[PDB]
Design a binder for this molecule. Sequence first.
Ligand SMILES: [Zn+2]
Lengths: 128, 94, 216, 93
Amino acid sequence: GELVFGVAHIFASFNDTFVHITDLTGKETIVRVTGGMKVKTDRDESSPYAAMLAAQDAAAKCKEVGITALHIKIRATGGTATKTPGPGAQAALRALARAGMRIGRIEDVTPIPTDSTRRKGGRRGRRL
Amino acid sequence: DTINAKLALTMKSGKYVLGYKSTLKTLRSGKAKLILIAGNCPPLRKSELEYYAMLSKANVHHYAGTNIDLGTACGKLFRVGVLAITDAGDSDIL
Amino acid sequence: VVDPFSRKEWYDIKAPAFFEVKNVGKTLVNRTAGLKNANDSLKGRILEVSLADLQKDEEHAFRKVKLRVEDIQGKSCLTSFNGLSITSDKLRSLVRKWQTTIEADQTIKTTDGYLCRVFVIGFTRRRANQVKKTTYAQSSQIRAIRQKMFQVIQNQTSSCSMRELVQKLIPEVIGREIERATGSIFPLQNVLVRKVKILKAPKHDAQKLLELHGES
Amino acid sequence: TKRTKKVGVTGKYGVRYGASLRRDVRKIEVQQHSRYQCPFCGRNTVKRTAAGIWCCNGKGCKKVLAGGAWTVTTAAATSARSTIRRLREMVEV
RNA sequence: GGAUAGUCGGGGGCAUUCGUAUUCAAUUGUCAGAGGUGAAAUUCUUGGAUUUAUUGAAGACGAACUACUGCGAAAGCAUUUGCCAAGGAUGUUUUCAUUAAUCAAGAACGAAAGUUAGGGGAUCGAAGACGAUCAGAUACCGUCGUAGUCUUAACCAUAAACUAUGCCGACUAGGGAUCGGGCAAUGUUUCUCGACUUGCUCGGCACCUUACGAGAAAUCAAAGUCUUUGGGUUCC
RNA sequence: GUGAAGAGUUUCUUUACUUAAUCAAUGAAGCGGAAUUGGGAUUUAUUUCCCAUAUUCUAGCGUUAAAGUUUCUUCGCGAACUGAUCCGCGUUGA
RNA sequence: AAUUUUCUUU
Ligand SMILES: [Zn+2]
């Protein structure tokens, strides 16, 4: 039993992906890297390549401390929004798996509403 | 069963006493089984009536509703403060 | 500016004695210095961990319990029961079309100061010979089912305390009793406690933790 | 005879002070000069004296109640009484 | 029409209970971007943004279950429980006995938006402010944002308020689903009842095929029973 | 005035005390600490870690002491203790 | 994203 378990939150939005890694508790986190600091184009923040770059950078910084296994928890925008994880969620999962860090207890913790407040758009909606 | 219907059928077939002075007279004479006290009663009068019923071994029911509600339940157009059921008739008020 | 990891220490987390495991994981707390106590900054932490991990059996994988770290004993923090819930994947899988879902709740009290709002959810089931695909129950039957769940919860939780509450939630006796009591009504299926919430807590049980712990 | 289409009690004010101000005063004075029921006697004999004091006559229950400016009870006070009642029950239990 | 028995209903009102989500507030952890978009851009962030973790408050709404399914005269009605009044269908060798149908005039309710005073104002968001697109964008796009969106006491009184199809009554072709009730099964199942299966019937929501029939046709079990033109009655 | 931490033979910052000094209340009317007292967990338990309150009432009254062991000697509405635990560097609070 | 206009007839 020489394994150390952390908690890796993934926030897979359609605009930018968050790869947050903390300890087994909630506070006193170690690593937080997104696609914004991996690509500077302001367009490919949610790209799978940028998500995997952030995920592997998080893996390297976690291996620096010496933590082996992570309990993964992916989550979309949630609330009164799309509620669908972006393309970077699977890219981050594969990057963590490929980096050699152990993965356990996959779960989706996107915040769902019980018929929450009105969504923006104005009835007719975003007529783009 | 409810008590308003029971009170109504005691009114149809039973013996009732209205007011405070007559209720005290009935309790004093001992021909009393149940007394009904409205929620709007004076506290001193309620304590006196409870003491009278305890002395005479008569049951007390301080039902909800004002004296207006008690009179409406009794079927009268005036306010009723204290009810004294002397004969239940064919009911189970007591 | 220096490395922020030089002011951090690793401590073990000990789940309460109700479970089948002792070591759950490790935490992270900043360096203990003056005017700021690691003990003061540690007691406000919440952990989530799977009941399968706590029981060394995959029979409770969908269930996940939360613990509240309260006491520190020899650089090994001790936690207490804080609630149980069901995974989103399990809940979405359980929820299905062309069936009736009945969910109820009740607040319970233990022998000591403890207010627990426990929920329960149950779904209608087919009889392996039904030809139709509706399988719906009337609202009167739903209300009768809710009354049966209320009676079962009250009877089984009249005097248990938290020890018996944990000892009876793992084998799922509440759902079994609800299904047994619902024999005269729609058979019902997948009856389980979806979430238990904790509203009041005792005076830290500073001595009862010593009473329960101290073994192995 | 109706004797007044809409002004009612504000007919003493004639044509001055404005219609909206007269209407607001009319509502206030209608509330102010109203007989209310004693919550202890059940008689519609409660009348206002000096903006916050309400008294009912009779042989009994000569109590003097502290109420609103022109109503015996205000909505805010009733809400506060319910809130205090709720808090007291939670503290006791 | 009324009564009676078991039911049924997301029908109405009052009181009560619960749920996550949104916003905000306090506190804790590392640091450089975060939002947003086709692309961006406004804005704020080494004074700690965003995220993660704990606690609390506010208001709104009852996701999934949720359906060619239910209720109400319609507008509409979807968290738990209790109370009150009322309602349709069903069962009935119960009661009255024509009490009936449709309506001028006159009245009740009447989504949303709009008005007058009180409370509350989380989210969204008319007006508006900026920032991108365009030749000009005054709009569609992003952020903020007043009235409004909630509620009480008074108002009005209209929507593609639609089934673009008035109400009552009789008849008319084959079948299968669904809701509520009732009847029948020496039917099945689970520690006298429920669930499921089959058949019959009444009252609804609808569906498939067809056209004896209708229409100018699209189509219609009524929009059929109309040159073979007449059951009754309003609106237009 | 008195002390504790951080710092390039010395005092910059914050962070503790009250008697200086300031404010408020009052008839400067009960501030603080000790012994039993029953729950309480240290535990083949020891006040060792914990602090506990008498008046909810209905528009009544509540004062000039009663009761107690025991002292003249029991002429006494006599003198003391207690009833009303003891103690004190602070009238109370900011 | 972005795409406005085609006089009166033969
Ligand atoms: Zn009075």
